Amino acid sequence: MTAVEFIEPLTHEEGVSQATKLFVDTYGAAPEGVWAAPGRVNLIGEHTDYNAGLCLPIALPHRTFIALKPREDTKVRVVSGVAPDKVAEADLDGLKARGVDGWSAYPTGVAWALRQAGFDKVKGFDAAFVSCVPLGSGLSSSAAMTCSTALALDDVYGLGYGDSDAGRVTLINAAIKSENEMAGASTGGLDQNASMRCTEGHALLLDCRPELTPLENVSQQEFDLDKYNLELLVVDTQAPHQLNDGQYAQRRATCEEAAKILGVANLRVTADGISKADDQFQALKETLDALPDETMKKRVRHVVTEIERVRSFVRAFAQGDIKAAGRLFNASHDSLAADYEVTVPELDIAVDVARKNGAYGARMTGGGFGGSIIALVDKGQGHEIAQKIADRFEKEGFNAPRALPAFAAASASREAKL
Ligand SMILES: OC[C@H]1O[C@H](O)[C@H](F)[C@@H](O)[C@H]1O
Ligand SMILES: [Cl-]
Numbered sequence: 134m135t136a137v138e139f140i141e142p143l144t145h146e147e148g149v150s151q152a153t154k155l156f157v158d159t160y161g162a163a164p165e166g167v168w169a170a171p172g173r174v175n176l177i178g179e180h181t182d183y184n185a186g187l188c189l190p191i192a193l194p195h196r197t198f199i200a201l202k203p204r205e206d207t208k209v210r211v212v213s214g215v216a217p218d219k220v221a222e223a224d225l226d227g228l229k230a231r232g233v234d235g236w237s238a239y240p241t242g243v244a245w246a247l248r249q250a251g252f253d254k255v256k257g258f259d260a261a262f263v264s265c266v267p268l269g270s271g272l273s274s275s276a277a278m279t280c281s282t283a284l285a286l287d288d289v290y291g292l293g294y295g296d297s298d299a300g301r302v303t304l305i306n307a308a309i310k311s312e313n314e315m316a317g318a319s320t321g322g323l324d325q326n327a328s329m330r331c332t333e334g335h336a337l338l339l340d341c342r343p344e345l346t347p348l349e350n351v352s353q354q355e356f357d358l359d360k361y362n363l364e365l366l367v368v369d370t371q372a373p374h375q376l377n378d379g380q381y382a383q384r385r386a387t388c389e390e391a392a393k394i395l396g397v398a399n400l401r402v403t404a405d406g407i408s409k410a411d412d413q414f415q416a417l418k419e420t421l422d423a424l425p426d427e428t429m430k431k432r433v434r435h436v437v438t439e440i441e442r443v444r445s446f447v448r449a450f451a452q453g454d455i456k457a458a459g460r461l462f463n464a465s466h467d468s469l470a471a472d473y474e475v476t477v478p479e480l481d482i483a484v485d486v487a488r489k490n491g492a493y494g495a496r497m498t499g500g501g502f503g504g505s506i507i508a509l510v511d512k513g514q515g516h517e518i519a520q521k522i523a524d525r526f527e528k529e530g531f532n533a534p535r536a537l538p539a540f541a542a543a544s545a546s547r548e549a550k551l
Pocket of ligand 1: 175178179180181182183319320321322323324499500501
């Protein structure tokens with residue numbers, strides 16, 4: 134057997150070097166520059182973004198690097214280091230939703246979304262992508278690709294949105310629209326806000342109420358694992374799963390109906406009225422009594438309890454109460470498994486192994502149905518716990534997992550410019 138693999142992040146130098154070489158190898162021309170956006174881990178606040186809730190992501194050090202050059206036509210050529218001999222080619226001129234074949238829908242759809250928003254200066258482009266955000270890990274390779282492209286296009290076309298947090302929300306919205314409308318992949322905005330608005334050493338307390346302005350809807354929370362002698366273990370289960378299989382879309386449909394039945398614009402309205410009540414049990418009971426469907430009650434209970442767990446976590450971590458922080462991780466996972474029903478055995482067994490082996494807490498992160506777990510562990514324990522999960526996976530007959538180093542890293546940025 135092989136020891137469990139840790140997937141290291143590309144350095145600035147490696148990402149620039151590799152994205153530039155793929156660009157020159159593919160297109161001959163030099164790119165105008167290289168941009169990059171990170172993947173993410175959601176610490177807590179899962180399945181709350183599209184309910185106008187609270188989230189708490191960090192940006193991983195793992196980034197997607199885009200070498201890009203604008204074109205004076207409307208042609209979009211893209212290549213990825215996974216498949217360097219397969220250049221995808223579309224044209225923005227009269228391009229419609231779902232008009233683009235395969236992975237290239239994600240970057241092409243960003244240019245489309247900017248044009249649809251009236252950025253008429255945005256024409257075609259050539260790009261090359263090199264990533265270390267692991268595929269199928271639930272760590273937002275999708276956002277790393279769309280957000281790196283949105284930042285690169287903003288820069289080369291001088292749109293003026295990339296150089297401010299509030300400006301980056303315009304580029305976030307284009308990235309989200311690409312994924313939802315061009316690629317046909319249902320997504321809230323958790324991942325794209327993380328990738329473009331996180332900061333090094335901080336978690337992004339993101340308030341997803343849609344009426345908030347950018348300076349109202351984030352709060353950088355201290356997330357210095359070294360201050361508490363901690364390590365955030367991240368394990369990609371590599372469990373076989375399927376994007377756009379309809380499960381994630383169903384959860385969203387279920388929440389929207391719940392909100393319709395409750396007569397509220399979103400479940401955050403419901404959650405906040407419960408949270409403010411003196412008797413939160415009774416406020417929840419009265420809400421779930423208004424939902425006749427037994428699955429819908431479960432989904433609403435998850436959303437309401439998870440939003441409050443975010444607040445609880447921000448307080449626990451600021452207090453250095455790592456046991457309390459870990460219990461909140463654990464209650465988030467347990468809710469996602471029992472009430473939201475978005476876990477699978479690989480996630481649940483990895484989490485149990487982490488819990489049994491000294492984690493303060495452990496949970497799936499991201500959408501679920503596969504992908505990754507995270508665990509708050511003591512510094513120096515991540516490798517041991519990752520290998521315990523790997524040994525257990527082999528006993529279970531599961532695909533080997535892989536792990537990634539993790540800490541709160543910087544958001545998207547320009548990496549190089551001619
Ligand atoms: O918190 C669950 C997440 O699932 C997926 O990653 C989505 F992309 C995010 O928007 C979010 O809903
Ligand atoms: Cl559902």
